[PDB]
Design a protein around this ligand. Structure first.
Ligand SMILES: Nc1nc2c(ncn2[C@@H]2O[C@H](COP(=O)(O)OP(=O)(O)O)[C@@H](O)[C@H]2O)c(=O)[nH]1
Ligand SMILES: Nc1nc2c(ncn2[C@@H]2O[C@H](COP(=O)(O)OP(=O)(O)O)[C@@H](O)[C@H]2O)c(=O)[nH]1
Lengths: 468, 468
C-alpha cells in the first residue's frame, strides 16, 4: 500500500509551501508601503526568515526521497546499473586476441590542464565504446608525468594496449572506417565528421532506468568512463588513504574549489572567498536540520597558496581542511610536474567525496569532481552550487530544453515561450532566470528557469550482450 | 520498486522550489533598492510571477499524490475505513433487545442554530460510542421542526428509539454510571466530568490507518457521525436529486458560504464578496493547470438575499448557482421552521459536494459542509480556505501543537518557541503567522505557522468486534 511516513511528508511539504505563499503575500504587501531604512531592514528580515522556511521544505523533500525503502531501492538500482556499464566497458577493453581487435587510438597530449586532458580521454573512450573499438591510450611524454598514464592509474586494458593492426587510418566517419582496424581520433575540436556518441546524450537502452534513479543522466554517463579511467595504481590508492588520515577528512564536509591564477582574465572571473562561503554556510544550515554538525568542515582546493590563511581568518568558526603545499605545486611555475599532477588528483578526490560542492563549473577541475561524485551515491546530481556555468562537457552537442509553461516577456531582455518550444540554454543565472535562444523564434534572452524541462537526448549505443 | 513518474515529479518539485528560492533572493534584493510607485509596481509583478510559480509546485505535488496507483489505494483504504466505522455505528445503534440496552439520552433543543445543534448531536453520539451506549435522540419541539428529527432525517436507530430502562441518572462520569442503564447527557458546556471521547482526538485503533489516508483525522472522525446522522428521509432525498437537476450543479464548481445577518457584530465580521472571490479565482487558476475549465462555477450559499445580484454583476465571467429563495427563507424573522431547515440542508449539501470550499470557519454552516466533504473523497482535508477561524469543534479539548523549529521573537507580538514546546493554537492568520499560547512559558502571541506540527491525540475507544 502507501507508506505512513511518505504520506505525512508529502502533506507537510504541501503545507509548508502553502505557509510560505501565505507569508510571501503578506510580507511583500507590507514591504511595498515602506521606505528608506525601515524598507531595507524589513527586506533583510524577510530574506532571513525565507531561508529557514525554504530549508525546512527542502529538508522534508530530502526525507521524502528516503522513506519506505526508497533510499535502499535507489542504491540497489544505481549499483546495478554501474556494475552493468563497467562490465560492458571492461569486456570491450579486454579482447582475447589483441592482434585482431578493432581499436581506436587516443593521444593524451592535448595541450591543456589535467581536467581538460582527462575529459579528452573520456571523449575518446565514449566514441570507442560507441564504435565497438578497444580504446588504445597513448600517453608517453604526458606533460604531467612523461612516464604516462600508468604513473598514477591502471592501464585502460589488461590484454590489449598495442596499436597494431592490418589497417590504420585517421578518423573519417563510422561508415567509411567500417573495415579499418585501427582508427586515430583527434581532439574534439578537430573532429570531422562528428559521430553521435557525445555528451550530453545517453544510451537509449539505459535512458528509462536512469530516469527512475538519477537527476542528470548525461553526467552519470560521462562519470562511468571517468570511474573506469581513474582506477588507482596500488601506490596511489595508498597515498589517498594516507592523506585521508593525515588531513582529518571526515563528514560532514563541504568541498570548495577556488580557481585563480591564469583562469582569471582568460576564461573565468575572480571570485572572492565570501562568494563561495555564502553557499557553504547556506548548505551547512540545511545539513544541520537533518544531522548534528559538530564542526563545519570545508575541504578547500585552490591554486592560490595565499587563500588558506585568508579563509581561516575570515571564518574562524569553520575548520578548513586543505593541503597548502599542494596549492603551492599548482602554481604556474610548477604545474606540469608529477608532484603537481598528484596534488590535483588528490584535491579532486576529496572534492568529489564531500557532501556538497561549491565552485565554478567553468573549471574542468570542479566538473571532474562533480562527475566522480556521481559514482559515489545513488543521485548526487544536485549536490553542487556553481558560481557561473551550468554543467557542461567541452565539445558536447547543443544543450536544449523544452518550454512547458508559456512566458510573456516583461522587458526586452526576456524572450517569449510557448509550451513545446525548443530552448537552447546557455546558462542559469541562479536568480530565477536562465539565458538561451528560443529556436522556434530565433530570439535570444532571459526566461524563468522553472518554465522549462530538460530535453534528454538518446543515442543507439551498442549494448555488448556478450559481457554478461 | 520506484515509479518513473514519482521520481521525475519529486525532482521537479525540488528544482521548482530551488528556483523559487533563487528567484526570491534576487527579487527581494532588488526591491530593497526601490521606493515609491516603482517599488510597488515591482512588488505586484513579483507577486503575480510568484503565484504562477507556486501553483506549478502545487500542481506537481498533486500529481505526485496520484502516481503509481496511490489514488486507487487511497480510495480503497478510505472506503474500508468508513465502511468499518459506519458498520460499527450501525451495530451500536440497533441492539436486539431495546429494553435491556444501555442508552445515552440526548436532547436536540440546544439554544442555537442548525449547525450548532447538529454538532451537539454529534457530541452526544461520540460520547455514546465511547461508552457503548445506544444513542437516544429526543427532538420534540425542535425549533426547526416541531415534529422532530424524522421530519428530515431517518431515525438514529431501527430497533431502539425508546428511553426506557431499569435505572436512569444525569451524567456523573463513566465510572459512577457503570451500572446505570439510561444516562442523560447535557450540553457540553454543562458536562462534568468530561470523558475522553471528544474532538479533536481520534480512536487509537484507527489513528495509524487514518494518517496513511487523511490529512486531518480529527475532522474525519467527526465526519463519520455526521454522515450517519444526515441519512435523509425519502422526500428530502428526492428533493436533493431534483435541486441538482434544476440548478445545473455540475463540476468543476467552488462552494462559497457568505454568512452575514446576525453573525456580524457578534461572533464574526462582515466580509465583502470581493474577499471570498480572490480565493475562488486563485483556486480556479490552480485547477486550470491540470484540467480544462469550461466555465467557472460557484455555488453561492448565503443568508443575505441581496448578494446573488451583486455577485452576478461584479463577476460577469462567472456562473453563480444559487437558490435565492432559500437565501430568503434564512432571514432572521422566519429562520426557525421546516422550509428554512430544508434550505440550509440543501445549501450545506451542495457546499459539501463542491471541489473547493471558501467561507468563514467561524460559521457552523461551513464546518458541517467541510465535514461532510471529508466523506466524499479520500482526503479533502485541505480543500478549503477560511477567511477567519481554523477548523474547530464546539466543546473540543484544547487544540495543541508541538513546536518543531525554534523561534526568537522579532517583535513583542511574537512568542518564543523551542523544539518540544506545547503550543495551544487559537488561530491561523493566513499570513505566515498563527496565534496561540506557549504553554511552557505561559505567553500568548504570534509564531510562524510552519514551525509547529500537529499533536494528534488518541483515545482508547471500544472497537465493537461483534459488528463484523
Ligand atoms: N592541486 C590543484 N591544482 C589546481 C587547482 N586548480 C587548478 N589547478 C591546476 O591547474 C589546472 C587547471 O586546468 P584544468 O584541469 O584543465 O581546469 P581549468 O583550467 O580550471 O578549466 C589543473 O589541472 C591543475 O593542474 C586546485 O585547486 N588544486
Ligand atoms: N439556507 C441557509 N441558511 C443559512 C445560511 N447561513 C446561515 N443560515 C441560517 O442561520 C443558521 C446559522 O446558525 P449555525 O448553523 O449554528 O451556524 P453559525 O451561526 O453561522 O455559526 C443556520 O443554521 C441557518 O439556519 C445559508 O447560507 N443558507
Amino acid at each position: 500500500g502507501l507508506g505512513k511516513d511518505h504520506e505525512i511528508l508529502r502533506r507537510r511539504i504541501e503545507n509548508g509551501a502553502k505557509e510560505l505563499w501565505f507569508f510571501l503575500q503578506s510580507e511583500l504587501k507590507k514591504l511595498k508601503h515602506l521606505e528608506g531604512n525601515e524598507l531595507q531592514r524589513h527586506a533583510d528580515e524577510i530574506l532571513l526568515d525565507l531561508g529557514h522556511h525554504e530549508r525546512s521544505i527542502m529538508t522534508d523533500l530530502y526525507y521524502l526521497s528516503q522513506t519506505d525503502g526508497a533510499g535502499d531501492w535507489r542504491e540497489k538500482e544505481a549499483k546495478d546499473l554501474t556494475e552493468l556499464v563497467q562490465r560492458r566497458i571492461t569486456y570491450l577493453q579486454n579482447p582475447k586476441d589483441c592482434s585482431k581487435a578493432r581499436k581506436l587510438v587516443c593521444n593524451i597530449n592535448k595541450g591543456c590542464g589535467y581536467g581538460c586532458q582527462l575529459h579528452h580521454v573520456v571523449y575518446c573512450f565514449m566514441i570507442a565504446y560507441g564504435t565497438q573499438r578497444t580504446l588504445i591510450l597513448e600517453s608517453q611524454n604526458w606533460r604531467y608525468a612523461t612516464g604516462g598514464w600508468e604513473t598514477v592509474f591502471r592501464p585502460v586494458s589488461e590484454t590489449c594496449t598495442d596499436r597494431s593492426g592490418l589497417s590504420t587510418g585517421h578518423w573519417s566517419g563510422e561508415v567509411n572506417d567500417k573495415n579499418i582496424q585501427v582508427v586515430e581520433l583527434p581532439i574534439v575540436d578537430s573532429l570531422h565528421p562528428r559521430p553521435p556518441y557525445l555528451p550530453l546524450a545517453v544510451p537509449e537502452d539505459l535512458a528509462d532506468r536512469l530516469l527512475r534513479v538519477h537527476g542528470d543522466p548525461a553526467v552519470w554517463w560521462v562519470s562511468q568512463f571517468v570511474k573506469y579511467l581513474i582506477r588507482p595504481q596500488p601506490w596511489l590508492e595508498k597515498e589517498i588513504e594516507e592523506a585521508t588520515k593525515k588531513l582529518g577528512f571526515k563528514h560532514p564536509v563541504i568541498g570548495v574549489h577556488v580557481r585563480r591564477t591564469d583562469k582569471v582574465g582568460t576564461e573565468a572571473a575572480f571570485h572572492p572567498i565570501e562568494e563561495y562561503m555564502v553557499h557553504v554556510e547556506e548548505h551547512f544550515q540545511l545539513l544541520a536540520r537533518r544531522m548534528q554538525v559538530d564542526k563545519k568542515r570545508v575541504y578547500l582546493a585552490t591554486d592560490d597558496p595565499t587563500l588558506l590563511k585568508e579563509a581561516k581568518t575570515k571564518y574562524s568558526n569553520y575548520e578548513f581542511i586543505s593541503d597548502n603545499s599542494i596549492s603551492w605545486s599548482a602554481g604556474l611555475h610548477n604545474r606540469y610536474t608529477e608532484n603537481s599532477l598528484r596534488g590535483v588528483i588528490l584535491d579532486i578526490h576529496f572534492l568529489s567525496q564531500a557532501d556538497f560542492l561549491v565552485c565554478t563549473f567553468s573549471s574542468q577541475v570542479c566538473r571532474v569532481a562533480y562527475e566522480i561524485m556521481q559514482t559515489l551515491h545513488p543521485d548526487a546530481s544536485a549536490n553542487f552550487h556553481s558560481l557561473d556555468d551550468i554543467y557542461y562537457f567541452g565539445g558536447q552537442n547543443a544543450h536544449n530544453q523544452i518550454a512547458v509553461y508559456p512566458h510573456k516577456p516583461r522587458t526586452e531582455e526576456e524572450i517569449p515561450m510557448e509550451p513545446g518550444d525548443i530552448i537552447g540554454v546557455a546558462g542559469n543565472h541562479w536568480d530565477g532566470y536562465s539565458k538561451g535562444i528560443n529556436r522556434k523564434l530565433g530570439k535570444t534572452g532571459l526566461y524563468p528557469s522553472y518554465k522549462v524541462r530538460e530535453k534528454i537526448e538518446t543515442v543507439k549505443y551498442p549494448t555488448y550482450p556478450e559481457a554478461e
